[PDB]
Design a protein around this ligand. Structure first.
Ligand code: HEM
Ligand code: D0L
Ligand code: SYN
Ligand code: CL
Length: 454
């Protein structure tokens, strides 16, 4: 039995002030570099343990011993995502019911049905960049967020946010972004009942109303028309859980759409932004990926089967997820008393945080070149030990969107590499903004068209 390390304390505030920063996940990564594979973190009225090693995370991923916990972050998001899949407890009826109904709509086979709608938004991105004037630049995370939000809107509930027609986002997106900001800001808000925050609370309730009104109206419109589309909303309206025999109620369908819209906006855009960042910083890797894109994408419009053929592009995306997993942590609780790693006794209910960027820097797994961007380290994935690579979470509570995110990102990155050469014209210094997720901030490039028609 070992006593685990703990970072510096602030008297009665314990460790809490360490997270009073715009970059708290990056702060925790530096603490993990100093303290190692596990450290205790205390705040008034709570304790958790941050895990960074594959040795310990492999055990945390044992669903017989640990289940998904709602982090305080997810509990605050639950005020607008409700009992949607990501903010529900495993033991809530609506978790397994929505899981059973939606799993077949998110399978690799299901991606064939979304492919045409994904191509529609991907072509809008390519056309935007084709239409820039000489020496104009691209705002990378901005355009990747326009694309990923519009893709899940069109695939989620056949709704066009038309983000490529705008400087200022659709009002729904303004409200969702401000609600996500309020949720994450509340993690570091001392005295949340101070009248100073009456405006924040009023604004939060207004933003919840904007999101619910749009989504509830589209659900009501669809039910009335009886229209059948190639979309998640159609699948959720037609679906019955084989176990309970029940469909989802309209309120839960709304929470699933809001959940999907948060994911589209926050996750996939970050992955594409980090992937392009790593490609422009590693020109030999960019060349190899561009050669594959040219070899495989032989038609004006990529096909579903061509996207599956972009093997090296898939490896580039996995290597971007390794270094900067855009959903950077998940939380677990001990189902029963148990000993972690032969060393750390835990009581039933004790919480763990998995610090995914640190797991992905475990030199015992990846070797001494762990900070290098080397997609080829994914060439022989059977050689990777269990639970070493966790950008999509764990077990039955893993990302339902994984096939959707990777299909969209592979299609889009493949088209970007087919159609343009890229220049890091500012020699951009990586600056990672933290919202629900991690994204480059201020990342800009210049594209030079290869003048290949669509
Ligand atoms: C349109 C894209 C996406 C959608 C619709 C989506 C949707 C979801 C949903 C519904 C869940 C909850 C699953 C459940 O517990 O039953 C989830 C979990 C998760 N997703 Fe995704 N996701 C997407 C993209 C991504 C991407 C690109 C990443 C990472 C780069 C990501 C990382 C995760 C992680 C880490 C979890 C587990 C969270 C936890 O354990 O607390 N997601 N996603
Ligand atoms: C998709 C990613 C969602 C979760 C990412 C977590 C993102 N947090 C943002 C701050 C650090 C990180 C985290 O470790 N927070 C924990 C612990 C915690 C609870 C209360 C206040 C501060 C921290 C939590 O939210 O419970
Ligand atoms: C709605 C919140 C959420 C959280 C983690 C992954 C995907 C969605
Ligand atoms: Cl102290």
């Amino acid at each position: 039995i070992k006593e685990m390390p703990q970072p510096k304390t602030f008297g009665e505030l314990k460790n809490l002030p360490l997270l009073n920063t715009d970059k708290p996940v990056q702060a925790l990564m530096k603490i993990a570099d100093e303290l190692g594979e596990i450290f205790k973190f205390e705040a008034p009225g709570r304790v958790t343990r941050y895990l960074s090693s594959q040795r310990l995370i492999k055990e945390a991923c044992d669903e017989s011993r640990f289940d998904k916990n709602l982090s305080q972050a997810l509990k605050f998001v639950r005020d607008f995502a409700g009992d949607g899949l990501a903010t529900s407890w495993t033991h809530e009826k609506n978790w397994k019911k929505a899981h059973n109904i939606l799993l077949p709509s998110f399978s690799q086979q299901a991606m064939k049905g979304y492919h045409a709608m994904m191509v529609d938004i991907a072509v809008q991105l390519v056309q935007k960049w084709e239409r820039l004037n000489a020496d104009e630049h691209i705002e990378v995370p901005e355009d990747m967020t326009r694309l990923t939000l519009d893709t899940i809107g069109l695939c989620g509930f056949n709704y066009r946010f038309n983000s490529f027609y705008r400087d200022q986002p659709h009002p729904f997106i303004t409200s969702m972004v401000r609600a996500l900001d309020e949720a994450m800001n509340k993690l570091q808000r001392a005295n949340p009942d101070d009248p100073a925050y009456d405006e924040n609370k009023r604004q939060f309730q207004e933003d919840i109303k904007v999101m619910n009104d749009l989504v509830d109206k589209i659900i009501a419109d669809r039910k009335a028309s009886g229209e059948q589309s190639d979309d998640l909303l159609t699948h959720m309206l037609n679906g019955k859980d084989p176990e309970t025999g029940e469909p989802l109620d309209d309120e839960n369908i709304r929470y699933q759409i809001i959940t999907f819209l948060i994911a589209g906006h926050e996750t996939t855009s970050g992955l594409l932004s980090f992937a392009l960042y790593f490609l422009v910083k590693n020109p030999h890797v960019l060349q190899k990926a561009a050669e594959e894109a040219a070899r495989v994408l032989v038609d004006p419009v990529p096909s579903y089967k061509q996207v599956k053929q972009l093997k090296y592009v898939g490896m580039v995306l996995n290597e971007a997820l390794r270094l900067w997993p855009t959903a950077p942590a998940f939380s677990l609780y001990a189902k029963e008393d148990t000993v972690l790693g032969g060393e750390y006794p835990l009581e039933k209910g004790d919480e763990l945080m998995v610090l995914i960027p640190q797991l992905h820097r475990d030199k015992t797994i990846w070797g001494d070149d762990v900070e290098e961007f080397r997609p080829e380290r994914f060439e022989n994935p059977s050689a990777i030990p269990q639970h070493a690579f966790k950008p999509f979470g764990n077990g039955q509570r893993a990302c339902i969107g994984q096939q959707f995110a990777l299909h969209e990102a592979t299609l889009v990155l493949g088209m970007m590499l087919k159609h343009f050469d890229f220049e890091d014209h500012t020699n951009y210094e990586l600056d990672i903004k933290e919202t629900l997720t991690l994204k480059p901030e201020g990342f800009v490039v210049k594209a030079k068209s290869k003048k290949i028609p669509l």
